[PDB]
Design a protein that fits this description.
Number of domains of chain A: 2
Radius of gyration of chain A: 20 Å
CATH architecture of the largest domain in chain A: Up-down Bundle
CATH topology of the largest domain in chain A: Growth Hormone, Chain: A
Order of helices and strands of chain A: HHHHHHHHHHHHHHH
Oligomer: homodimer
Helix content of chain A: over 70%
Family (chain B): Belongs to the major facilitator superfamily. Vesicular transporter family.
GO molecular function (chain B): monoamine transmembrane transporter activity; monoamine:proton antiporter activity; serotonin:sodium:chloride symporter activity; xenobiotic transmembrane transporter activity
Lumenal, vesicle side (chain B): 89-97, 151-156, 220-235, 287-297, 344-348
Distance between the termini of chain A: 43 Å
Shape of chain A: globular
CATH class of the largest domain in chain A: Mainly Alpha
Number of strands of chain A: 0
Strand content of chain A: under 5%
Bound molecules: reserpine, serotonin
Main location (chain B): membrane
Membrane topology (chain B): Multi-pass membrane protein
Amino acid sequence: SRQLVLVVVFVALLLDNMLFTVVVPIVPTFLYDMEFFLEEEITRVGVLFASKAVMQLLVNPFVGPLTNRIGYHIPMFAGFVIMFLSTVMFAFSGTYTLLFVARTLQGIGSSFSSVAGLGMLASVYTDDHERGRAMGTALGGLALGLLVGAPFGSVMYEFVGKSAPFLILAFLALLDGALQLCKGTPLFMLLKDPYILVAAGSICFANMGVAILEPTLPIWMMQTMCSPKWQLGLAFLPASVSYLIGTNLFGVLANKMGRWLCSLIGMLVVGTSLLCVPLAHNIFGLIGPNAGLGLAIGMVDSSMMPIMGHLVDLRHTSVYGSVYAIADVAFCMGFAIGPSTGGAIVKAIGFPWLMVITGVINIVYAPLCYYLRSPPA
Amino acid sequence: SRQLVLVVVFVALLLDNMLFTVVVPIVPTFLYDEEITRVGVLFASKAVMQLLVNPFVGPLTNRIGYHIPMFAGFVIMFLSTVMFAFSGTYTLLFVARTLQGIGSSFSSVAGLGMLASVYTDDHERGRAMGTALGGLALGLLVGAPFGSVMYEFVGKSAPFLILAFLALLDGALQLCILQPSKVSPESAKGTPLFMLLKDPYILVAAGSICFANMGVAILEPTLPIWMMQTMCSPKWQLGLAFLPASVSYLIGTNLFGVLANKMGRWLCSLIGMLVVGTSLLCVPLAHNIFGLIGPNAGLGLAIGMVDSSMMPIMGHLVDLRHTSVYGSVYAIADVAFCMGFAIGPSTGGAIVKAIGFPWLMVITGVINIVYAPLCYYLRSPPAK
Ligand SMILES: COC(=O)[C@H]1[C@H]2C[C@@H]3c4[nH]c5cc(OC)ccc5c4CCN3C[C@H]2C[C@@H](OC(=O)c2cc(OC)c(OC)c(OC)c2)[C@@H]1OC
Ligand SMILES: NCCc1c[nH]c2ccc(O)cc12
């Protein structure tokens, strides 16, 4: 039924973001467990975190003709196979080499599942009005999975073991497939104008703060904070709660006070939050700056997503998910460059210099948002 | 007696800054009985001369104390206001403005130095400067309408005669409290100024003050011309358009002088520079007078934040690194103030005719924004 595809797409996006967030506080702690010095391993940790983003990067365009040739269900189903294999590989992983392959399959399955499920949702709903509601429900499921995943893996590692949240995620995925078992202006012309490129760089630089924080904040915590091993994923809860509050709030506020002002203020608070992050000497210090950073990224997304839609609509022709490809290129850009470059930058210089560099980059990029106010064509 | 030094500087900056803004709506209307440029050179005569006397005023405070410079500032302000009251031509009004400049330089350097010296606790010192800047904000707030209504009703010399009487009362108060009759040299030999320009920290703080006050100082000469060119506003609203900046500057300087210590000086300066840059960014987007109360109030709050944060941070730096002599650093701060006040009004029309007002606002705002993260350098400067 029409509701069935909605529930399977909701579950798929939920589990995908859950895997993304659950991999975060397990890898550094798993690395700590075996060697029983992370400055030498941090660069490969960053590469292992960016592998999914880079593989997704090379795999986005190929799904396009593949969707047309063989429909939408089969790419949706194969996404299941890849993420189920990635989940079982994550739980049984004992070697770094296996984990890199699992991250690569995670990227493949995430790209396949996202594109195929969004296309299937577009195909099923042809009423021209409920499509937006269905997309909103799917994105709400994405945000909810983002909120839930980190407390899942962090709490359920030292309490009921290491293979627990991956096995439970695989079981929930198996419930997903049982439910599912029963245009123009290409993106490489839409990157041809300075306005859309500035907006994409805006979203990429806004998300690069959390992208660079994810590989390095847990290792920073075990090196100075001495926090308990169950608290690492809990230490990112402000970045999700404040993100949800900010994204809901600024959306009504955004149009009254201008989208460009929202984006500029969001980048300013992103830079300030990243600067204020490396001074905390205990976990309660991180709640302020991390909550501010989450609210900032929520403001930036809620201001720049409609401005990207307006920019695509006013000059070019957009589709149901034409804005999807541009933003995801920024997200994969950040999650491939920030994690990869971050290991080298923390090996060469300290983590505080990394945070200062990212904050300064956001601050200097902040004045460029004037370019988007009333653009012409 | 530690509190009685704050009330003196509270009234010294009140009267001297009163004559700065009262003369603004009284000189070009009086002279009327290329011409705009000669009028604008009147205003910047204080700003140019005060910049040069400042390097000779700062080190002078070391060798004679702080009382005599403030007494001389009282005398010079008395002479400047009296000469303003009677002079009725350009060459007679230029010397009066330069005299007001020299008096303002004396009063500002001596007052900020004596507040820094008598207030030793850093959090406690962060409050005297805030209230003194509040008195300054109230002075520039009441200066313009005072001169306007006095010139409309009671005459031209009367707003300057009353200022002379208040200056006489200020001199009596100074002779009662401070006793400026002897030259007292500071026991500690203060550091030379040109070593202090080799400190990155002092240069960054002075640059922050200079860029914020350049942002405020560029706006005042250039805003009313753009107003008449674009919105076609009646003349009576011109001075009222800048009132929220003064009001917000007073409120912000009091409030953030209270909390700059709890919230953090570097974060206060950074947020203030960011908000002043953003406010100048949205200033040339106003399509009527009602759109300017917001950004102007934000600009005033930003400048009050940056001023209350960086005003005691200079004393903090000079105590953490250099010797405990405060004349030179606050002389540099007043130099930054006067440099911003000097580049603005003489070159405002030239820059507007060259590139345009919105591009000037964009340039100043982007300069403030990119200079903002350099204030993170002031988080914890190492000691000697
Ligand atoms: C991880 O997986 C993601 O990459 C998602 C998130 C990335 C990032 C993040 N990661 C964290 C990990 C944490 O634990 C350590 C803690 C906090 C965070 C935060 C806080 C900040 N944050 C944002 C998250 C949001 C998701 O993006 C969308 O919701 C979205 C919205 C849209 O418009 C409504 C779109 O347009 C239709 C769209 O498609 C282009 C996507 C985004 O991509 C799917
Ligand atoms: N130093 C405070 C700058 C300033 C704030 N408000 C003002 C009003 C008028 C003026 O000439 C200057 C100002």
